[PDB]
Paper text:
Adhesive pili assembled through the chaperone–usher pathway are hair-like appendages that mediate host tissue colonization and biofilm formation of Gram-negative bacteria. The formation of this biofilm is mediated by Csu pili assembled through the archaic chaperone–usher CsuC–CsuD pathway. The Csu pilus comprises the major subunit CsuA/B that forms the pilus rod, adaptor subunits CsuA and CsuB, and the two-domain tip adhesin CsuE that binds to various substrates using exposed hydrophobic finger-like loops. The rod-forming CsuA/B subunit deviates from the standard Ig-fold and adopts an unusual architecture featuring two prominent hairpins A′–A″ and B–B′ protruding from the β-sheet.
Here, we present the cryo-electron microscopy structure of the prototypical archaic Csu pilus that mediates biofilm formation of Acinetobacter baumannii—a notorious multidrug-resistant nosocomial pathogen. The structure of the Csu pilus rod was determined to an overall resolution of 3.4 Å. The Csu pilus is a thin (around 23 Å) left-handed filament with a helical rise (z) of 28.0 Å and rotation between subunits (φ) of −153°. Pilins are tilted around 60° relative to the helical axis and about 69° relative to each other, resulting in a zigzag appearance of pili when viewed in sideways projection. In contrast to their classical counterparts, the subunits in Csu rods are linked together not by one, but by two binding mechanisms. First, the incoming CsuA/BN+1 pilin subunit inserts its donor strand GdN+1 into the hydrophobic groove of the preceding CsuA/BN subunit. In the pilus, CsuA/BN+1 not only provides GdN+1 to CsuA/BN, but also inserts its A′–A′′ hairpin into a pocket in CsuA/BN between β-strands B and E2 and loop D–D′. Moreover, the GdN+2 of the third subunit CsuA/BN+2 that complements CsuA/BN+1 binds through its protruding N-terminal part to β-strands A′′ and B in CsuA/BN. Finally, residues in β-strand A and loop A–A′ in CsuA/BN+1 form several contacts with residues in the A′′–B loop at the bottom of CsuA/BN, thereby bridging the two main binding sites to form a continuous binding surface of 600 Å2 with 41 interacting residues and 13 hydrogen bonds. Thus, the clinch contact confers pilus rigidity and determines the trajectory of subunit movement during clinch formation or pilus stretching.
Numbering used by the authors:
A (entry chain D): 1 to 14
B (entry chain C), C (entry chain B): 1 to 155
D (entry chain A): 15 to 155
The structure:
Amino acid sequence: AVTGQVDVKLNIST
Amino acid sequence: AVTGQVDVKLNISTGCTVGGSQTEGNMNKFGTLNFGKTSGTWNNVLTAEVASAATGGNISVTCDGTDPVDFTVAIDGGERTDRTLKNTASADVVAYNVYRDAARTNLYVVNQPQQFTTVSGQATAVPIFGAIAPNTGTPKAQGDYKDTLLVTVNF
Amino acid sequence: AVTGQVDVKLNISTGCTVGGSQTEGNMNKFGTLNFGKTSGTWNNVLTAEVASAATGGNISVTCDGTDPVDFTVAIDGGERTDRTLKNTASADVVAYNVYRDAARTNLYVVNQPQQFTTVSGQATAVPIFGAIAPNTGTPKAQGDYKDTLLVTVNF
Amino acid sequence: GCTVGGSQTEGNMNKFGTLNFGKTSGTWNNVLTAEVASAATGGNISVTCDGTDPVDFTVAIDGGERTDRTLKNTASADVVAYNVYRDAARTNLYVVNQPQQFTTVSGQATAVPIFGAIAPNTGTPKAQGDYKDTLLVTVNF
C-alpha cells in the first residue's frame, strides 16, 4: 500500500 | 476510557514499488495536475496530465517480482471528497475529475481500485488524466485554486 | 506482605462510545494498519490507513450526548514502546509512526491525548494514518512484521 | 525485603491506585477498558526490591468488596461485573486470591500492570450514578 499525493492546480486570472 | 487494539502489519518479501515520487516529509509526493492559467469563464474543457514530482513525466510504477504482477490504482475524492479545487482565499470551488485513458472516458471512480498490469523489468506508467467541465456560467473569482488528491497504489 | 487498595470506578450517566470495533475476547479490536507487501529495501514511504475490524473503513466514534462532546484520542508506542514492527521469527525491526492528518504531519505523539470533537447524531471518524520511512539501507529479512498498537479513546 | 512504589498511605491502608473506566451510558456495546493509575505518581504501580540478586515476588488481587468483582452503585443496588487482567490483551487474568508470579532486578522499577476490562452491556441499562469497588491488591512474597 503506497499512498501518495497529487497536487491539483488551476490559476483563474487572465 | 475505551482502549482497543490496532494490529499493524507489513509483509517484507517481494513487493511492488512506485517510481516518480518524492518524499515530502513523511508523505509521498506523487505529482502535480496542472491545468494552467484560465479566465473566469472557459468554454473549452480544461485538460492536463499529471506530472511526476521526481522526473516531470508520468508516475512510473515498477514491480520487483519476476512474474507479471497485477497491481491496482485508486484515487480518492480530494480534500473535500467531491473533487473540487478550492480558492486559496475565497470559498469558490472548481469541480474536476481524473480519468485513466487519454480520451477522458475511463474515470478513476472515487475509492475504486482501477486494475493495472506490470511485467518484470519495465516501467508501467500510471496515466492520471485530469479534465474540467466547461464553465460557461458564472465567472469564478480570481486567484489560485488547489486540491490534493491522494493516489493509493494498493495491491 | 504489602496489601493495598485499588479503587475501581465507572460513571454510568451519558458517555461516549467507539464504533468500528469488534470484541476480541475481552479486548476491543479496533482495526488493522496494513502497509501491504514490500521488498527488502523500499525507496518510497510505505503508507496505509487503519481499517476498522467491524466495517472495513475508519473507526467511527459517536457520542451519546445531545451537546457537542470533546473527546480525546491517544495511541501508545506498540508492543516494544518505540513503534517498531517485529518479524514473527527473526529479531529484525521496522520503525513506523501513526499520524492524524492525511499529509503525515500531525503525529499521534505516544501517550498523548490528541483532541477531537463530536456532534449529536454523527460518526466522527478517527483517522489513524500510518507511515513508514524509506528503507534504502539494509534489506530487512523476509517474512511478516507485526505490532499491536493500543488506541486509547479516553475522555 | 521488597517494597512497592506508587502507593500513598491512606490513613493506615496503602492506597495503590485507581481503575477508572470513565463515563459511559446505560448500555455500552464496546468492552469498557482502563488501566490502573497509581495514586502517588499517576502511572503504573512500580514495585522495586531492595536485594542485589533478582527476587521473584508475587502479586495477588482479591474479588472486591463483594468478592465477585462487581462495582456497586453508590445509591441503588445495581451491580457492574468486571475483571482485572495482567497483560495488555486481556488474556492473562488475575485469578481471585492467586499469586500471579513476577520478577524484579536490582535497581529497577518493575511495573505491575493491572488492566481492567468490562464486558459489553447490550442487555439492561444499569441505573444512572457512580459505580465503585475497592480491590485489595496483595503484593506478597
